[PDB]
Amino acid sequence: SNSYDSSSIKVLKGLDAVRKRPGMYIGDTDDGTGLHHMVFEVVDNAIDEA
Amino acid sequence: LAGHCKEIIVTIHADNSVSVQDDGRGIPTGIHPEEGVSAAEVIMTVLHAGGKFDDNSYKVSGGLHGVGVSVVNALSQKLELVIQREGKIHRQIYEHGVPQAPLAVTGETEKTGTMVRFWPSLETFTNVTEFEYEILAKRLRELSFLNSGVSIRLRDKRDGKEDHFHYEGGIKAFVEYLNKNKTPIHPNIFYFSTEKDGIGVEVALQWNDGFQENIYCFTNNIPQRDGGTHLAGFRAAMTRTLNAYMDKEGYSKKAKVSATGDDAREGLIAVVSVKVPDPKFSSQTKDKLVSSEVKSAVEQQMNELLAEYLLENPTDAKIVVGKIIDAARAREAARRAREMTRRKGALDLAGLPGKLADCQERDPALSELYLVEGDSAGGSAKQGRNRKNQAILPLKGKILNVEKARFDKMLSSQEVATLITALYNPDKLRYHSIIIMTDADVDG
Amino acid sequence: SKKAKVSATGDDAREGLIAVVSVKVPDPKFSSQTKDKLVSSEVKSAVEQQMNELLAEYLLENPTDAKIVVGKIIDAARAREAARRAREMTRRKGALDLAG
Ligand SMILES: Nc1ncnc2c1ncn2[C@@H]1O[C@H](COP(=O)(O)OP(=O)(O)NP(=O)(O)O)[C@@H](O)[C@H]1O
């Protein structure tokens, strides 16, 4: 309504931005897509190393 | 959405740039207590920086990530930002996300708002260097439909064409506008606006005689191209409620219809707009909503209110059920036309029982086969034949010609060729010897 | 096609096919973090021209495989055409409700 100022702009340092909005970083966290996408990204990094 | 901005102006300039003028409260321009610079420079130069991280400033809002405007600024060769607040006009120039000068004051005014004009960079976008009118037009139209009372003006300095959309009917009026080139089946449009468990839902759907499925997935005034969990709940609720209604009324018993989910959504135009305090999107494009509580809430609301609608309007219910049964009968008639021909490609009847009376011997080239009239001749033929190496195949009337009407699918009896060979013949050569007994008349 | 009298659309010729497309691009372009959709058109054109060359070579170097695939395509096209024809005809004219 009227709560607007420079203090309202919040900046998330480190990995706080990922933990606050995991959707754009991991996908869905409820149906099981992100829990498997964890291992998917890990194994994809391994294959990129290979 | 906070109830302060009531006019938004989008102007397409001739220099390949788009300016957005609104009359909201304005972007905060004060010095950030941690960054050290103005909050505008913070949101333009720092990722995930803004006031959309809580409900203190925006109780309900579609923006939740905090990187969008930074992406818009970085992927632009130049950007101009003019902010009006507290009687001061703040101006700053950006180039590829790099501020050219600090946020300075240029003058004073009495209005509040923010102007965002950016020149998109050509080093990133390929094959598309000019903004298309139709996509922006559709976006602003549907935005004005979902935002009653919010004036939206589109200006185009390239050709002078300008439009103004201030629809107040809502998504009902949106569906009515999208049904201008179609033919609806029911006048009364399903519509509601509820808010349960902190999450609001507003769905407007209408059946039309077309055959295209277009369910616009909207979440906090954001279109979802890939749908999401809310779309899945919508579809499941619609399917289960229509199935229950067609089962309890007896239509599925009179017509013997499976009534799958795809047939229930045949020729349906739906607009699902939900209000979520803290949604969850799988990407910045916001093409998918991954909130399952929203799924459950929308599912429950749709089931309840759609059952109410179908049990309060008998005529519209009958028309909708008739259209669903029409679509399902079309699908199953196509299934018949497919698998009946697929089975005609194979052999299923084989005409073995009924008329064929083989002999005791099974080794071919020893038995005999005959072809006579069934009821007139075959009776006495079987009563006077042998039961060792004799076989008789009766006939019925005449047989259609081959040359006059040649069709690989045309078949009435098919028993002769199926019983003598497999129809190709070198494999099965049963009944090497056949004899055709025939009357001495002219028809013989 | 002169004798079959069919259209052979995209969704019909690819019916009953299991294909695997593995591309190798130095600088990929994924429209999301999940990497569920590629947006590179240069890879599109490269794969397209490589197919138009090598699949053509394959179909002209193997008569038996070619004739079997074309027979399957003719079967699918005739099936879909007959299905559309019968569905439309019955639903629009041959449909008779109220069995009583
Ligand atoms: N038009 C605007 N009016 C007011 N504040 C704005 C405006 N645009 C940006 N801001 C502020 O700048 C911050 C960052 O904006 P933005 O990056 O668009 O957030 P966003 O909507 O979450 N982007 P995204 O969720 O990825 O689509 C917001 O949280 C606001 O505080």
Residue numbers in the entry:
A (entry chain D): 2 to 51
B (entry chain B): 52 to 474, 483 to 503
C (entry chain D): 303 to 402
Quote the study on this structure:
The type IIA DNA topoisomerases (Top2) are nanomachines that control DNA topology during multiple cellular processes such as replication, transcription and cell division. DNA gyrase plays a vital role in the compaction of the bacterial genome and is the sole type II topoisomerase able to introduce negative supercoils into DNA, a reaction coupled to ATP hydrolysis. DNA gyrase A and B subunits assemble into a A2B2 hetero-tetramer of approximatively 370 kDa forming three molecular interfaces called N-gate, DNA-gate and C-gate allowing DNA binding and strand passage. In this study, we reveal the complete molecular structure of the E. coli DNA gyrase bound to dsDNA and to the NBTI molecule gepotidacin using cryo-EM.
The overall DNA-bound DNA gyrase complex was solved at 6.6 Å using 94,633 particles. The estimation of the local resolution showed a broad spectrum from 5.0 Å on the DNA-binding/cleavage domain to 8.0 Å on the ATPase domains and β-pinwheels. The atomic models of E. coli GyrA and GyrB domains, solved by X-ray crystallography, were combined to build and refine the complete atomic structure of the full-length E. coli DNA gyrase holoenzyme in complex with the DNA duplex in the cryo-EM maps. The dimeric ATPase domain is sitting in an orthogonal orientation above the DNA-binding/cleavage domain (~95°) as previously observed with the T. thermophilus DNA gyrase12. The overall structure is asymmetric, with the ATPase domain slightly bent (~10°) towards one of the β-pinwheels bringing it closer to a distance of 27 Å. The ATPase domain is sitting 11 Å away from the DNA-binding/cleavage domain. Each β-pinwheel resides on the same side as its respective GyrB subunit, with an approximate ~45° angle from the center of the DNA-binding/cleavage domain. The spatial arrangement of the β-pinwheels induces an overall ~150° bending of the G-segment in the E. coli gyrase. The 130 bp DNA duplex is chirally wrapped around the β-pinwheel orienting the T-segment in the DNA-gate groove formed by the TOPRIM and tower domains to form a 60° angle positive crossover when T-segment path is extrapolated. The combination of the high bending angle of the G-segment (~150°) with the peculiar orientation of the β-pinwheels positions the T-segment to access the DNA-gate with an almost null or negative angle of ~−10°.
